[PDB]
Scaffold this active site. Structure first.
Site, PDB file in Angstrom:
ATOM      1  N   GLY A  54      37.857  43.293  40.019  1.00 56.92           N
ATOM      2  CA  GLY A  54      38.823  42.892  41.037  1.00 56.92           C
ATOM      3  C   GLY A  54      38.403  43.209  42.463  1.00 56.92           C
ATOM      4  O   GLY A  54      38.924  42.626  43.413  1.00 56.92           O
ATOM      5  N   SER A  55      37.483  44.158  42.614  1.00 59.59           N
ATOM      6  CA  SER A  55      37.094  44.678  43.916  1.00 59.59           C
ATOM      7  C   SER A  55      36.267  43.658  44.693  1.00 59.59           C
ATOM      8  O   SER A  55      35.192  43.254  44.248  1.00 59.59           O
ATOM      9  CB  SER A  55      36.284  45.940  43.680  1.00 59.59           C
ATOM     10  OG  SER A  55      35.596  46.329  44.846  1.00 59.59           O
ATOM     11  N   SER A  56      36.759  43.275  45.871  1.00 52.76           N
ATOM     12  CA  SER A  56      36.057  42.309  46.721  1.00 52.76           C
ATOM     13  C   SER A  56      34.611  42.740  47.039  1.00 52.76           C
ATOM     14  O   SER A  56      33.692  41.942  46.879  1.00 52.76           O
ATOM     15  CB  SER A  56      36.857  42.043  48.001  1.00 52.76           C
ATOM     16  OG  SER A  56      36.344  40.922  48.695  1.00 52.76           O
ATOM     17  N   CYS A  61      32.701  44.651  45.357  1.00 52.66           N
ATOM     18  CA  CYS A  61      31.933  44.509  44.121  1.00 52.66           C
ATOM     19  C   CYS A  61      31.571  43.045  43.856  1.00 52.66           C
ATOM     20  O   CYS A  61      30.458  42.749  43.431  1.00 52.66           O
ATOM     21  CB  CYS A  61      32.692  45.078  42.910  1.00 52.66           C
ATOM     22  SG  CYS A  61      32.865  46.876  42.950  1.00 52.66           S
ATOM     23  N   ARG A  62      32.527  42.147  44.064  1.00 51.89           N
ATOM     24  CA  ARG A  62      32.300  40.723  43.821  1.00 51.89           C
ATOM     25  C   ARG A  62      31.235  40.139  44.723  1.00 51.89           C
ATOM     26  O   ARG A  62      30.474  39.272  44.293  1.00 51.89           O
ATOM     27  CB  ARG A  62      33.607  39.961  43.909  1.00 51.89           C
ATOM     28  CG  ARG A  62      34.492  40.224  42.704  1.00 51.89           C
ATOM     29  CD  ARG A  62      35.784  39.453  42.749  1.00 51.89           C
ATOM     30  NE  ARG A  62      36.843  40.090  43.530  1.00 51.89           N
ATOM     31  CZ  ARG A  62      37.295  39.691  44.715  1.00 51.89           C
ATOM     32  NH1 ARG A  62      36.725  38.714  45.397  1.00 51.89           N
ATOM     33  NH2 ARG A  62      38.328  40.324  45.244  1.00 51.89           N
TER      34      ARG A  62
END
Ligand SMILES: N[C@@H](CCC(=O)N[C@@H](CS)C(=O)NCC(=O)O)C(=O)O
Ligand SMILES: N[C@@H](CCC(=O)N[C@@H](CS)C(=O)NCC(=O)O)C(=O)O
Lengths: 207, 207
Positions: free
Chosen positions: B8-10, B12-13
């Site tokens: 979910g972490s931006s 991370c994405r």
């Protein structure tokens, strides 16, 4: 090379010190934010985000202090010591630069700006974010003379601008022993320190 | 190459998409923040700032998503198109990366995080900062297919992670015509888009 700035501005000071370190002469152009000079059409054509510092170098308009720092080293550095070729060395520096923006200076802005710019009372929870950021920097500096490698880099210079702004704001840096050690050394070795400190004292007028 | 993350972490994405774009396989290691897995001594030894994403690549521990993005391109890119050698090209990308952190995603965090993480009512003045950030991005994209050069770069990929987080948060991106155009194209061309969108929908569970 045109440099739109004010002396009190921390991100401007990071660029001033970096330019002194690489030995590139800047045409220093004061841009009076209180007069809205950054908001007039002539400046918006250069930087539509209307921020300082802004560099204009042979047709290339660039803003974001930490981007400017790296560009000045890449273009004007007689050596790459402030921003080495090695991607691994660069990555640590880049990490520190993002730390400076998003953790350390962000904590400065969130705590002091509402006070000096909006006349709001101090927010003690925002103060705890400053303490957390200094704690992290203190850990990063454990056993290290510089913040992001064996020698001075643009990460140190960015952090010096930030930490000196904390100093003039009366934050007790001495509580963080590694930060204090690094910082006191940085004053002695960082090109442009004196001009940076003059600007910190200009910034102090807002307190 | 170990990659500590949550879907979910931006930030991370942004790394997930970048790794897919350069074709480097990551050993994806979920790090459960709600269980405090990032706060245990075993993780603090890797990253004392206890943040995700964190990369560990052949002994090199690196955090800050945008630093990780650049490192992955420099090390694993068969070409440098996502982060070209030219310092001028790099500088524009770097500027955009700082914009993504300090202006655009910062506006996301300041408006949505108090709501979803502290259960605070929405702050309409913080909302205006989101609007200002989208206005700037809209201007940057005037006449441009990509955010920071002639082709897709790590700046686009970082911005896609941020803007897709806004999308799932129900921000009306369509109001900014250049952003909307760029964003809809980016979905079609950006490696790892589908995985990014899955993660946005995971993030949505917080709303
Ligand atoms: N992230 C920036 C911040 C630049 C910035 O916010 N500068 C302030 C002055 S210290 C400014 O130009 N404010 C005027 C405005 O944004 O309209 C950088 O590092 O250069
Ligand atoms: N500037 C960062 C932000 C990373 C970040 O704040 N990650 C959050 C999750 S989205 C986190 O690890 N929070 C846990 C903590 O800081 O203790 C980056 O771009 O990587």
């Amino acid at each position: 090379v045109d440099f739109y700035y004010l002396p009190g501005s921390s991100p401007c000071r990071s660029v001033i010190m970096t330019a002194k370190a690489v030995g590139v002469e800047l045409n220093k152009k004061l841009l009076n934010l209180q007069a809205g000079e950054h908001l007039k059409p002539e400046f918006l054509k250069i930087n539509p985000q209307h921020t300082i510092p802004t560099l204009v170098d042979n047709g290339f308009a660039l803003w974001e202090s930490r981007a400017i720092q790296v560009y000045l080293v890449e273009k004007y550095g007689k050596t790459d010591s402030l921003y080495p070729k090695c991607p691994k060395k660069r990555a640590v520096i880049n990490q520190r630069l993002y730390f400076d923006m998003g953790t350390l200076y962000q904590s400065f802005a969130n705590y002091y700006y509402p006070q000096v710019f909006a006349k709001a009372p101090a927010d003690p929870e925002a103060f705890k974010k400053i303490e957390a950021a200094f704690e992290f920097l203190n850990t990063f500096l454990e056993g290290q003379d510089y913040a992001a490698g064996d020698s001075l880099t643009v990460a140190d210079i960015a952090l010096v601008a930030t930490v000196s702004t904390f100093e003039v704001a009366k934050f007790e840096i001495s509580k963080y022993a590694n930060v204090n050690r690094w910082y006191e050394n940085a004053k002695k070795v960082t090109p442009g320190w004196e001009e940076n400190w003059a600007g910190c004292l200009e910034f102090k007028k807002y307190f």
